[PDB]
Amino acid sequence: GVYINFKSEPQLGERGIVSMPLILSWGEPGKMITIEAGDDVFPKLGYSIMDAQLRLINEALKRAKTLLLYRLNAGTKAAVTVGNLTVTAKWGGARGNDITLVIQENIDDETKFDVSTLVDGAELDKQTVSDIAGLAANDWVIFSGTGALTETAGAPLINGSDGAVTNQAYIDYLAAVEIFDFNTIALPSTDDALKATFTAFAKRLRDDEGKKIQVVLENYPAADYEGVISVKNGVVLADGTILTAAQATAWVAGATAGARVNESLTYQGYDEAVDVAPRYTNAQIIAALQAGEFLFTASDNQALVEQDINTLTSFTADKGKQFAKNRVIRVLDGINNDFVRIFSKFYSNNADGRNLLKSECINYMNTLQDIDAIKNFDGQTDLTVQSDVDAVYIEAYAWPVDSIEKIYVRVRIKL
Numbered sequence: 001g002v003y004i005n006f007k008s009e010p011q012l013g014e015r016g017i018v019s020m021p022l023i024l025s026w027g028e029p030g031k032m033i034t035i036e037a038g039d040d041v042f043p044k045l046g047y048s049i050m051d052a053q054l055r056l057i058n059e060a061l062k063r064a065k066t067l068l069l070y071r072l073n074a075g076t077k078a079a080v081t082v083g084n085l086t087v088t089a090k091w092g093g094a095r096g097n098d099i100t101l102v103i104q105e106n107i108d109d110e111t112k113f114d115v116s117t118l119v120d121g122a123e124l125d126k127q128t129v130s131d132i133a134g135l136a137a138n139d140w141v142i143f144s145g146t147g148a149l150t151e152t153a154g155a156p157l158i159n160g161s162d163g164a165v166t167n168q169a170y171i172d173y174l175a176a177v178e179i180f181d182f183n184t185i186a187l188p189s190t191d192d193a194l195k196a197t198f199t200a201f202a203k204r205l206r207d208d209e210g211k212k213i214q215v216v217l218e219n220y221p222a223a224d225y226e227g228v229i230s231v232k233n234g235v236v237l238a239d240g241t242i243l244t245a246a247q248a249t250a251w252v253a254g255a256t257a258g259a260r261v262n263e264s265l266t267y268q269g270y271d272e273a274v275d276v277a278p279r280y281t282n283a284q285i286i287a288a289l290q291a292g293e294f295l296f297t298a299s300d301n302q303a304l305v306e307q308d309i310n311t312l313t314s315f316t317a318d319k320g321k322q323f324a325k326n327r328v329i330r331v332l333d334g335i336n337n338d339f340v341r342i343f344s345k346f347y348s349n350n351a352d353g354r355n356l357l358k359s360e361c362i363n364y365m366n367t368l369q370d371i372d373a374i375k376n377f378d379g380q381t382d383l384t385v386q387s388d389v390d391a392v393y394i395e396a397y398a399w400p401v402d403s404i405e406k407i408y409v410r411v412r413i414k415l
Contacts, residue, residue: 013064016065064254078160083150186253202227212333318366
């Protein structure tokens with residue numbers, strides 16, 4: 001006979017991704033570099049996570065899980081020539097000038113040479129060869145030339161430099177990052193022109209592309225947009241380091257990206273900070289908050305986030321004060337990004353099709369309520385789905401925990 005049986009085959013987004021454009025002294029230029037928190041950055045960036053040169057990378061990764069780094073400058077490669085041999089830095093930048101070539105006749109076999117590459121006096125590579133041909137590039141330099149080698153007690157590479165970056169380099173960055181999935185961008189620059197461009201960039205992705213992200217700038221409350229956070233002051237670290245507001249954007253961006261949809265940065269302390277710079281009076285803080293500024297306040301030897309807010313200050317009936325709270329933005333961006341992902345991946349405009357979509361959204365909203373991201377959500381009335389012949393409309397009410405006013409959510413799906 002024939003026996004047949006059937007069985008089902010079963011099958012909230014994650015944030016944590018920050019991106020930052022930087023001017024460096026080493027590293028591959030104009031190409032997005034991905035660094036996971038805890039990763040050894042010496043190989044890729046030529047510096048230690050603790051070298052002052054990588055301070056911003058260190059700060060961004062205090063709260064973020066992944067950093068999308070973009071080096072804006074190619075700089076000039078340092079180099080040196082000894083006889084027939086030319087040694088050139090792998091990447092352009094002033095870091096190349098910390099490299100020194102050492103060529104000494106091998107002790108065991110006088111017909112060979114020991115070619116060592118030193119960085120800050122430390123030997124990081126040593127190759128024993130007969131001639132230049134036998135040499136192989138390493139993680140620091142490229143060997144060029146032909147013929148026999150010549151000894152040298154020390155031949156430091158020179159002419160290396162970072163050079164000057166063009167504002168156009170930031171345009172290349174934005175284009176490259178736009179293709180990646182990320183949550184927040186930090187602009188550790190005081191350039192007013194760049195701030196305006198990043199502000200426009202945020203508005204386009206968020207409201208024209210449906211790609212919800214945020215940009216963190218330094219002293220630019222003029223943005224007056226929920227997609228932009230403006231850091232007013234900096235902090236003082238336990239090691240004595242004073243970070244400017246521009247430098248502080250790194251941590252703020254990382255913290256914002258790392259923050260969960262149910263978490264607010266309000267009164268959280270800037271990791272490692274023991275004071276703020278500058279300090280403000282009660283009146284100045286109030287004025288700053290009213291102006292839409294993200295600022296730190298000193299308390300009990302810590303730098304606390306006064307209020308986790310973005311630059312939006314021109315509130316309207318359709319976009320109230322709740323939109324100024326970054327946690328509100330995280331929950332709403334989560335709804336947006338997740339929905340777009342769920343519908344585009346797992347999803348006809350008919351009774352059953354609409355019912356199934358409605359069920360999946362209700363389950364999603366219930367999950368947000370379970371993690372205390374929203375409250376007072378009643379799946380029995382807070383979400384509906386109505387039917388253009390192939391257009392589906394979804395209406396729902398979401399109540400963010402940090403808001404005493406419900407938010408209307410309208411979803412338009414086309415097939």
